[PDB]
Design a protein around this motif. Structure first.
Motif: not given
Length: 339
Positions: A24-28, A49-51, A75-76, A303-309
């Motif tokens: 899962a990835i966001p647009a950025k 992820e949300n888009e 785009t996705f 990667k860990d800093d992208y986690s929604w948590l």
């Protein structure tokens, strides 16, 4: 300080005879050269992820129906298609990620059952139709079960207005809009036995009466202490017993914390990173026993800093396979070892 390693084993290649490996990835991420390269090195499926959620695709309404905003979602889907990878569609029907106005007419009055079902058909036909042939798997209905209710159905606005028939109709209409897409019912807490039972019976009963549901998505938002791999295996065994139902592990991540725990770490404790690695190895060893039914395993973040948590719980967490600097974690090597 980025330390990606472009030469370590590819995750999806290591599992190529077993199941797709997704992220899962966001647009950025799609406009970041490092993120794009890392996605394509390791994953042969993506999820937005949300888009692609309802609130993201809906732009508004008028008295004649719905208006949409598809630029980012396009785009996705185009990224996946041009790179010869799958994209899972997350998600057509979901209580918690739809705007309140969707359940009202243009004058602000709550829709009747007939009018809301008509709007559901319109929404699914429009969204699945736009991406016909391009989205291999859709999470058609998300999180419709609530095991605290006697009949097991979440008392969302969908259920309050339509009763449970919104679920089966969503699948019928999605299958009409793209007959070749694989259609999933997706949920969390599949290792709570009472909830597992409600999910199992709902999907089995849909399938037995000819509803075109093809799979169960197990989110698998787990942690280093719960649930056990054996309980996850129990879920796979039960859900896989329904003829014609495949399984995707759709949103896999593994928090270092117990649920509802006040522990809060600034840097990741190595003992917990090691427990995480041990459990990921156990998990993938088990999943490899079920490749006849488990067809895709998606991690809920690169990667860990992208986690929604981190935002969701308001604290640092390390739930995935790559650290903040893109380097491989003990968990990465454990997943490679299990392959």
């Amino acid at each position: 300080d980025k330390m990606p390693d472009w030469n370590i084993p590819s995750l999806y290649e290591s599992y190529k005879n077993d199941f797709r490996i997704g992220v899962a990835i966001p647009a950025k991420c799609l406009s970041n050269d490092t993120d794009r390269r890392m996605v394509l090195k390791h994953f042969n499926s993506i999820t937005a992820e949300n888009e692609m959620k309802p609130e993201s695709l809906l732009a508004g309404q008028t008295s004649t129906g719905l208006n949409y905003r598809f630029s980012t979602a396009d785009t996705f889907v185009d990224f996946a298609n041009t790179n010869n990878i799958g994209i899972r569609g997350h998600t057509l029907v979901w209580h918690s990620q739809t705007p309140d106005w969707f359940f009202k007419d243009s004058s602000g009055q709550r829709l009747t059952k007939d009018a809301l079902l008509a709007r559901l058909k319109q929404y699914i036909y429009d969204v699945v139709g736009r991406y016909k042939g391009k989205v291999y798997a859709w999470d058609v209905v998300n999180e419709a079960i609530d095991e605290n209710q006697s009949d097991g159905y979440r008392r969302s606005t969908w259920y309050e207005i339509c009763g449970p028939e919104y679920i089966e109709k969503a699948f019928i209409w999605a299958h009409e809009a793209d007959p070749n897409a694989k259609l999933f019912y997706n949920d969390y807490n599949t290792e709570i036995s009472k909830k597992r039972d409600f999910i199992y019976n709902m999907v089995k009963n849909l399938k037995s009466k000819g509803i075109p549901i093809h799979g169960i998505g197990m989110q698998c938002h787990i942690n280093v202490n719960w649930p056990s791999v054996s309980e996850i295996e129990n879920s796979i065994k039960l859900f896989s017993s329904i003829p014609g139902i495949e399984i995707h592990i759709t949103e896999l991540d593994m928090s270092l914390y117990n649920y509802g725990s006040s522990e809060n770490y600034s840097t990741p404790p190595q003992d917990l990173l090691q427990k995480q690695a041990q459990k990921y190895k156990e998990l993938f060893t088990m999943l490899k026993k079920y490749t006849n039914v488990v067809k895709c395993v998606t991690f809920w973040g690169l990667k860990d800093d992208y986690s929604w948590l981190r935002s969701f719980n308001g604290k640092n967490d390390w739930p995935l396979l790559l650290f903040e600097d893109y380097s491989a974690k003990p968990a990465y090597w454990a997943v490679i070892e299990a392959s």
